[PDB]
């Protein structure tokens, strides 16, 4: 506490602190821009994040 997390898909963020922010973990932004090659989804993730619940925030970070 706080423990660095490595998700299956090889993303990194500091749990839980990186999920308690208005912005999503920077690892998820990069993944969506470069790997998924879809920058509009990354900017669309930024818009949903503040209104998301913690459970959804965790779920998204784990599987993205």
């Amino acid at each position, epitope marked *: 506490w706080p423990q660095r997390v490595v998700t299956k898909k090889g993303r990194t963020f500091l749990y839980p602190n990186d999920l308690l922010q208005t912005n999503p973990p920077e690892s998820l932004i990069t993944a969506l821009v470069e790997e998924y090659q879809n920058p509009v989804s990354a900017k*669309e*993730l930024q818009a949903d994040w503040p209104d998301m619940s913690f459970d*959804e925030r965790r*779920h998204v970070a784990m599987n993205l």
Partner: nanobody, 110 residues
Framework: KVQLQESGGGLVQAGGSLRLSCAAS????????LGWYRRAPGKEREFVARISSGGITRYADSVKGRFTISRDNGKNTVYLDMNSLKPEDTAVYYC????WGGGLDVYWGQ
């Protein structure tokens, strides 16, 4: 693998109050954003209301204050309580199921 069955709706006279409901099945719900889009007779899909997994409502300016969107976790249903309807609100109302996980898929109702 994700079902969206909408109910309610019909024909009402100005000033009335209709209620739309949409039920989801086949995946998660509590950790999902649901909403409603409407397409007027000659127009295109238009945002009406959103509600996030955290329970945060977003409304379009034209329908704000009149329409009210709510969700029922554990029943897998989202409700849109329309009040003081007007002729311009005549449209086909579609359900929305906004799930991320894999990388943002968007699902609609019939």
């Amino acid at each position: 693998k994700v079902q969206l069955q909408e109910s309610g709706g019909g024909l009402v006279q100005a000033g009335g109050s209709l209620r739309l409901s949409c039920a989801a099945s086949g995946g998660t719900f509590s950790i999902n954003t649901l909403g409603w889009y409407r397409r007027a007779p000659g127009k295109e899909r238009e945002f009406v209301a959103r509600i996030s997994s955290g329970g945060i409502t977003r409304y379009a300016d034209s329908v704000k204050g009149r329409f009210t969107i709510s969700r029922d976790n554990g029943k897998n249903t989202v409700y849109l309580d329309m009040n003081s309807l007007k002729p311009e609100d005549t449209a086909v109302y579609y359900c929305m199921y906004r799930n991320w996980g894999g990388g943002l898929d968007v699902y609609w109702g019939q």
